[PDB]
Every structure is written in C-alpha cells, then in structure tokens.
Amino acid sequence: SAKNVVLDHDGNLDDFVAMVLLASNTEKVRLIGALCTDADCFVENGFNVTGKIMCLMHNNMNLPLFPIGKSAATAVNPFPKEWRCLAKNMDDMPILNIPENVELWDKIKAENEKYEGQQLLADLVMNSEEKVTICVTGPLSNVAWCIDKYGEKFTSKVEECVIMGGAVDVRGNVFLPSTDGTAEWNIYWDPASAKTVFGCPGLRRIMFSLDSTNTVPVRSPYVQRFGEQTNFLLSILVGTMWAMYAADALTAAYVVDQKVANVDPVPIDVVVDKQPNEGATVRTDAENYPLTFVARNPEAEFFLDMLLRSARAC
Amino acid sequence: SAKNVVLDHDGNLDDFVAMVLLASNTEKVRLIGALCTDADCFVENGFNVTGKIMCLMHNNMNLPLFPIGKSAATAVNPFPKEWRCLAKNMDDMPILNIPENVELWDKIKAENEKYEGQQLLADLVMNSEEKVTICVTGPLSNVAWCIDKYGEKFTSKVEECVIMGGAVDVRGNVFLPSTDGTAEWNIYWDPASAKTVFGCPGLRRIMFSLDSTNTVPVRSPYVQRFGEQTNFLLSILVGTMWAMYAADALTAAYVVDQKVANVDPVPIDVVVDKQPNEGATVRTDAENYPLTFVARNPEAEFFLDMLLRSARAC
Ligand SMILES: Nc1nccc2c1ncn2[C@@H]1O[C@H](CO)[C@@H](O)[C@H]1O
Ligand SMILES: [Ca+2]
Ligand SMILES: [Ca+2]
Secondary structure (H helix, E strand, O other): OOEEEEEEEOOOHHHHHHHHHHHHOOOOEEEEEEEEOOOOOOHHHHHHHHHHHHHHHHOOOOOOOOOEEEOOOOOOOOOOOOOOOOHHHHOOOHHHOOHHHHHHHHHHHHHHOOOEHHHHHHHHHHOOOOOEEEEEOOOOHHHHHHHHHHHHHHHOOEEEEEEEOOOOOOOOOOOOOOOOOOOOHHHHOOHHHHHHHHHOOOOOEEEEOHHHHOOOOOOHHHHHHHHHHOOOHHHHHHHHHHHOOOHHHHHHHHHHOHHHOEEEEEEEEEOOOOOOOOOOEEEOOOOOOOEEEEEEOOOHHHHHHHHHHHOOOO | OOEEEEEEEOOOHHHHHHHHHHHHOOOOEEEEEEEEOOOOOOHHHHHHHHHHHHHHHHHHHOOOOOOEEEOOOOOOOOOOOOOOOHHHHHHOOHHHOOHHHHHHHHHHHHHHOOOEHHHHHHHHHHOOOOOEEEEEOOOOHHHHHHHHHHOHHHHOOEEEEEEEOOOOOOOOOOOOOOOOOOOOHHHHHOHHHHHHHHHOOOOOEEEEOHHHHOOOOOOHHHHHHHHHHOOOHHHHHHHHHHHOOOHHHHHHHHHHOHHHOEEEEEOEEEOOOOOOOOOOEEEOOOOOOOOEEEEEOOOHHHHHHHHHHHOOOO
C-alpha cells in the first residue's frame, strides 16, 4: 500500500541521496514525479542527474518511469555565487553513465523537457486519485506557486508536505555580510514563498529544520560501510556522494517511515523584510495561526540503517 | 621484461590516477614502492589511499605488494589548505573500502608506517639489482634529499627522473598577492630541493612542465566513457576520481611508454630567493649546466586511450 510521493529538489548531494531513498523503498513509496529548481545547482545538471538515477534504477529494479520537470522558479536571494552544486560532477559519475541506462535517458529525454516544473507539480498532485506527499528538499517557491494559483484545489490533494528548511530554536546557516545568521538557505532563497506555505491552513507541513538535521552528521566510518555493498549500484552511488549534514536524506527518510522522528506543532512565520534576519523562520503568537509540525530528536541510528539497507535495492 | 619504478607523489586526484596507470601496466612497469608527501594532501590520507589502491589491485590482478612510506619532508611554501582534502574524500570511497581489501591493508599497515619516505626511496633505488625510474608527481623534496645524503651512490642507480612540475615558456599556476604568477606549485612548495634536482649532473630528468600538461585536457565526454567499463574496479575508481586537468597522469603515462611525448634539452635553474617569482623554473646561462628534457606537444589521443585501456586491468 505505497503512498504517492513527488520530489521537489534543487540537485545537491543530499537531494540525490533523498531521491534514492524514496525510489528504492517501493513497498512504502510510489514516486510519481520529480522537479528541479535552479538554486543550489544549475537546473540543467540537476535535471540530467535525476534522469540518470531514475534510469539506472528503472533497469535494475521495480521502479516505474515518472515525469521530471525543470522549475522556472527564480531566486530572491541567490546561493553562494561560488561553490554549491555538485550536480555537474555527479553527471560524470561512472555508475550513472552505463550505456544501457544513458540510452534509455536519451530516448525518454524529449518528453520530460516539455514540462514546466511548477505546473507539473500542480498536475501530478491535482490529477492523482489518492493524496500525494510532497517532499521538498529545495526552496519552497514551487509549492507556493501551486498554492497561489490553485489554492484549496491543490492543497486538499496534498497528504502532507515534508519540508527540509529553517532553523527554529538553533542558529541558521546563512552567513553573509548583510545577514545575522539566524536564517537557513532554502528559506532565504525565496522568503516570500516560504511565508505562503508556512501560513497556509489546510496544508499539513512536516518541518525538518536545522534543529533536527544538525543531529545527523556524515561520518567516515559509516560511509565506509558502503564498501561492504559494492555489489549493489546504489551503494556505489550513495557511498560516493557521501564520500564527497544529511538534511535532505533525513527529510526523505521520514516520508519513508514516520519513526524517523516525532513532531512538535509550532506556529511558523517567515521574515520577508530586507533585514539581517531575512528568511528566518520564527514563532508567531497570532490567534489560531496554522501550526507546523517541527521534527525534533531524530532517531539517527534508525535513519543510518534505513539508508544502508535501502542502498541494497539494486 | 618490465622496468623497476618507484612513485613519489603527494596524494591529490591526478597523483592517484597516475598510480593506477603505473601499477596496472605490469608488462612495462614493475612498481617496487611509493612514498607520499604531506604537500597537496594530508599525508595520512594519501598514505591510506595508496594502501587501499594497492591492496584492491593486489587482490584483483596480481600486483605484487610493495612498501609505501611517509616522507618526513615539510613545506617551504604550504599548499592551499582547500586542496589537500581530496585524499580524505577518496579514503571513504566505496570502491576503496571493500572488506577483503581493507583487511589486507590493515594487516600490513603497521609495517609500512615504520618507513620514512625519504630513506625508503634511497633504499629502494640503491638496493635494486637493476636501475630505477622515479616518477615524481609532487614536490622534489625526496629526490633532493637522497641526492644530498648519498650523492652518486643514489643517482647512479636511477634510470631517470620523470617529473611533473615547473613552467618554462608559459605562465605558472601559483597566484598569490606576493607572487608574479610565473611559478608552478610543485616547485613553489620547495624551491631549494627543486634546484638541487635540476642542477644535478649525474641525474637524467624528463620534465613535464605546464607547457605540455596544459595541452591535454580531460573532458566530461571522455570521463563518462569509464561508464562503459563499470565491470572493471579500476574504471569505477578512475572515472570516479575525476567526476569529483591530468598533469600527473601524463607524467606516469610517459613512464609507461615514452611515445607519449618528445623532449627538448633545456638547462633549468630554480629561483630560490624569496622573490615575486620564487619557485620559477628558468633557463640559465651557466656553462656546462646540466640539461633537462622538457616534454613537448604530448600525444593527447594516445594518452587518453592508454588510460581508458589501463582502467580495464581489473
Ligand atoms: N587546481 C589546481 N591548480 C594547480 C595545481 C593543482 C591543482 N590541483 C592539484 N594540483 C597539483 O599541483 C601539480 C600541478 O601544479 C600537480 O602535481 C597536482 O597534483
Ligand atoms: Ca537541497
Ligand atoms: Ca601531485
């Protein structure tokens, strides 16, 4: 009885580890689509790696092909105009360039580049028979777009929106000359969109802010364990990426199984003014403000084992 | 018959690609040892990756084990601390952490740690029945040391030195506020040792400066071709290292087959004074100054095809 899931990411290492986690857990998750945003990665690269991972898996296990869209979303505050995306690097990974798999990608490529990510997310959620879980591991610009365009017609079709982003009771990670460091990148990239989502009633939001994601670090001894499963392509793929925080992986791990963490209802608002704390997710005492279920104290061992086992799907 | 060879590297990405070229070509090369310097890497990381690569190949293609030593050389001008981490990443790579290989490495790890790199190099060249070819892909600190300590007892046993470093008729790659950009990193790291090596009459030198290494770029299309050989452990290894220029690889290539490039005799001196051009390799007027054979116009295709084929050894 797998549930419909859509992955809304921005093509980074953990975004792809998160993709693998959703896709390899066929018993609990039916991945019906994915979209890429040109934030923490050049969309072109993020799009290609998404296709390459889907095909590698499609040809080795039970994984139906799904549509992949590039989002026309634009940044309000762009990521480090230096180093970020490793999507280009991954694009050259040998495990993702096996001829039979790239051949499939070349063949089904044209169909996908015809979609516009934002509209695709809307159509996958709204045309679905059963509800869909949106796993957002990049900015919230796309979920807000759908909300602003289709309102309740869109949200009522959402099972729940599992989000990686924010910093509630801990410091953020956006450290620029104009920021005080209380905000987190995914939110800071487009504060306005984040406000729309976090303030939209009728939408169940699971929030994986830095409060929870900072508790699951990437440690060498764990990563080395993938060397024990080199007979599985996914172990070579995941081990390699991590050899290079597991925020997005944790977020996707929850969609796979709730036991990853307990949630705590908190009224979340977003700072949109052009101040040092722009993009910070704060608490609001506004009367009956929609509550967001903030993830806390993640079962780290449960997650790490989930990932190790999942990398054995193929 | 194959020739004796020792690899003197500093554990960066192309140093390891070079090691794979040398070790895999058993018919031409008999790798009798390697040392790792704490230059463009943190020696301990480069140490282990060397052992992991050695053991992976030993258990999969009959590559005789050999001693690996840690050079005690210390920098004159340290490398950018942002580059020296590559070895760390490689140490966690799935393909280098297979159990049977790590078990072997862990058994022979202590003994190799007993060696001092420099002394090891001197002892391997001096105690060899046949002459030895030294492939230097990191600073020249170790060769300079052996020359100072044992003079001709050492250099007389050296078939030739194939070195990656310097910049003769082109600009260097060392750009700091206090430099003029004419020096290359391997020399800048330790100019004095470099001057000793280049000025030593009694030593045969093959120099792959930037003049030749800049003419052979390693592009994405090429790298992706290792995706056609994921059934070979080394193709996964090499293609992966790059996904994360190949000056060092060209140098090892020459050692495998000299058809890689033609050479030109040039009398090379090294600027050791703390000047804007410190570490620059310059032509000198000194009469009877020893000649160095500078690589010219390397054979691009030949090299690429050599590496692609060599990545199929196991
Ligand atoms: N980005 C970079 N620029 C210059 C040299 C670099 C480099 N990354 C690694 N190197 C090292 O420096 C030498 C070439 O200058 C090589 O031995 C190589 O291992
Ligand atoms: Ca992300
Ligand atoms: Ca090097």
